[PDB]
Amino acid sequence: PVEVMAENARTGSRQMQALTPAQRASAVNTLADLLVSREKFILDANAKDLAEAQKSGLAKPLLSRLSLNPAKLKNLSVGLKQIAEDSHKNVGRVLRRTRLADQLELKQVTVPIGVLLVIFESRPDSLPQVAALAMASANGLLLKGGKEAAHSNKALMELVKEALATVGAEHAVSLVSTREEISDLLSMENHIDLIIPRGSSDLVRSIQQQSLHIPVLGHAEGVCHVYIDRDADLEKALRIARDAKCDYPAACNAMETLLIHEDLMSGAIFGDVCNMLKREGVKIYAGPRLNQQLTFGPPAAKSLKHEYGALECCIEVVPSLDEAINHIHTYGSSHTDVIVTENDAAARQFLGSVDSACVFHNASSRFADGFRFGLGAEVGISTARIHARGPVGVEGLLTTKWILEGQDHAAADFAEGGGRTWLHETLPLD
Amino acid sequence: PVEVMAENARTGSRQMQALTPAQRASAVNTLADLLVSREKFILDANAKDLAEAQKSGLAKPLLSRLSLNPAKLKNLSVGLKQIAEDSHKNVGRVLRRTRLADQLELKQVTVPIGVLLVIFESRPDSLPQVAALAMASANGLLLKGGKEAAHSNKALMELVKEALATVGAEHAVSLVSTREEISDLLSMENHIDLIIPRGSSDLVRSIQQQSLHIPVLGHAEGVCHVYIDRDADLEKALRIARDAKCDYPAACNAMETLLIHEDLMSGAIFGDVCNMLKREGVKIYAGPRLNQQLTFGPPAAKSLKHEYGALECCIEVVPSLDEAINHIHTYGSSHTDVIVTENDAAARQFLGSVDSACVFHNASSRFADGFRFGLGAEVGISTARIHARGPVGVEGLLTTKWILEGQDHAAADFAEGGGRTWLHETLPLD
């Protein structure tokens, strides 16, 4: 059925909960060994499914993305080994050690979350990565593919189930049928905790709209912003904008705006940046203030909160820093915002005023990739304002659970009737 | 209006965001000085509103709770001073310091959340506590009273606005009218972040049901459980159960069940515990297994997942530890579960198997009060499975915000084209 999936997943979570030292590490190690030693199967299956899906011709993104090569499998192998090696102290780690009275020691610890539900469009390289993340964060996990990558998905699922059955001995990983009336599966509760979308803009949008009363990690928009201050080296700003837009224009955190200090427009920097974008072939719009600025110029931007993905980038100009800050707050989706300058003052102003999910300074807006932060293998880009924000490592999958080991204590024994005191001496946390 | 409330609150949040060292501490200090020096006003106002609400006779809980005495104001004063003294490093604290390459140092920091919405039934002693929590966690804050405590609420709001206008100079605290079509205000979004209910079971229930697409802290049920193991001192279990149930039977974390090891039923402990509860006057039910156990016994429990609040407590009996664990998982709302014993083995079994919000061992289920954990002044009892679990201090009001201060770096400059490396050396976090 459908619900027995989630129930058995929860049972398997309770199962895996108690093996931490060197067991789940060896489990994900063996998953890597499977992924390197049994590559013929998934390879031929991906060949079959791509050849089949060619004739339907769904979309160039999907039909170009669901490919799979021995190089990508080598990449998955080394990534799984990485998770294995740096995933030794994720479950059971303590966060506090307090003493309240004689022989009563509080300590808050780490636990799984529960039954994660991963939702992605056909992308058969994710599946082992997210399964390794599950097995290293000890929580059970469901999955949900698409219409394509079906046979590849089933092959990889059999692979991960084999790799998991070695130690732990219980299969808490699953998969659901063709779209399984996604609204129905989503409306469920008491079973699943985190809808982790992974597909694309359309998918996360439909999710956040349909999902009611269940926490949904991930974002929906990627409207960056790149404020070029008045005390920034010119070619510096040039290369920053170039490397921000001209590397993965369809990515989730690529600049879809570029504000400029109105003072600096006098130094022909506008001409230079337009020349650069034109050399790179980008259809630029203009902003109402810039629209008013020059003679006839580029077309008028439809909406300032628009998302292009292709090679398009609005350009507006603001008088003062604080106006730029207000602009970013009003329009930007608080995802990823930068600033380039050589002044420390404006740097502190920005980095302490803006409320994005992550703010840079003279860096490039294409660093928010999780892997680059030295943050393991990231499982999403959280923009939600609770529990996770920016790139989420695996620690975006672990809550807390207060435990307490007294001897004989009681509740009102600490009132005037009983002679018990308070210390609150923070012990050395392990 | 209603929305301009939230917008101005957000502006005030951005305002207060940048004063941390000794300023907000002095602000909440001065709030305490107001609460101690201007007590006549709120006192007479509470007198008036209680005298008025007497004639309507709404409910004994409310009409007994909205009282207010100089002793309670002394309590609020010392609590606000406590928050002041231990609230010095809540905003701006760093959590990581990483180095990725030459002169590019990541660091994840602490921030407010946004526009908190506190919802409580008439309880005019909370208002200054939650306003102090706001002003010490730097985030703006709305409020929502009830039909009673109205004049008291307005008096205390004027008081807190005076105290806040000293430093910060912007009023980011508000209040809304009589129930303001709670569904309307709740349906809002893009403005408010945390519905923090504080009233009672009915209130949090109506909230969690009505609230769609907005994070809601707090719980809805308090079904504890007290498993008395087979190697526990008898009078120990006696006093543990007594102090668990017979201190605040209407509280949110008072035992509403008591499982016993079927082996220990042979030692007349059942007779003793029933005698104790009877001496304390508690209408006990029985559990299906206990129902089958004895001759005619106490009545049959209607539903095992019931909530009494008054002096009633089911009693069931389970054969083996693991069966007790499964029982707690199936029925209990994972709020607060204990275990009494003298065996270390079963202790580890329990404390590592059960997935409640907090698990004790030989302690009393009436410790989960926030204040007792050495956890400041608690703002709720989180049972939600994200961002907060168990008693939430003020740290349940602070997310993270990755910042990044490089010199000249770029995105594809770290591919094969540019000679830049990776270090990931975790610097000493401040």
Numbering used by the authors:
A (entry chain A), B (entry chain B): 347 to 776
Paper quotes:
The bifunctional enzyme Δ1-pyrroline-5-carboxylate synthase (P5CS) is vital to the synthesis of proline and ornithine, playing an essential role in human health and agriculture. The P5CS molecule contains two domains, GK and GPR, catalyzing the first and second steps in the biosynthesis of proline from glutamate. The GK domain catalyzes glutamate phosphorylation, and the GPR domain catalyzes the NADPH-dependent reduction of γ-glutamyl phosphate (G5P) to glutamate-γ-semialdehyde (GSA). Our results describe the assembly mechanism of P5CS filaments, in which the GK domain forms tetramer and the GPR domain forms dimer structure, and both domains form specific interaction interfaces.
In the P5CSGlu filament, no ligand binds to the GPR domain. Conformational comparison of unliganded, G5P-binding and NADP(H)-released states shows that the overall structures of the GPR domain are similar. The structure of the NADP(H)-release state, which has no bound ligand, is identical to the unliganded state. In our models, unliganded, G5P-binding and NADP(H)-released states represent as open conformation, and the NADP(H)-binding state represents as closed conformation. The interaction formed between F642-P644 of the contact loops in adjacent GPR domains, which appears as a CH/Pi interaction, is critical for the filamentation. In the P5CSGlu filament, the GK and GPR domains are likely in a stable conformational state, while vibration may occur in the GPR domain of P5CSGlu/ATPγS and P5CSMix filaments due to the binding of ligands.
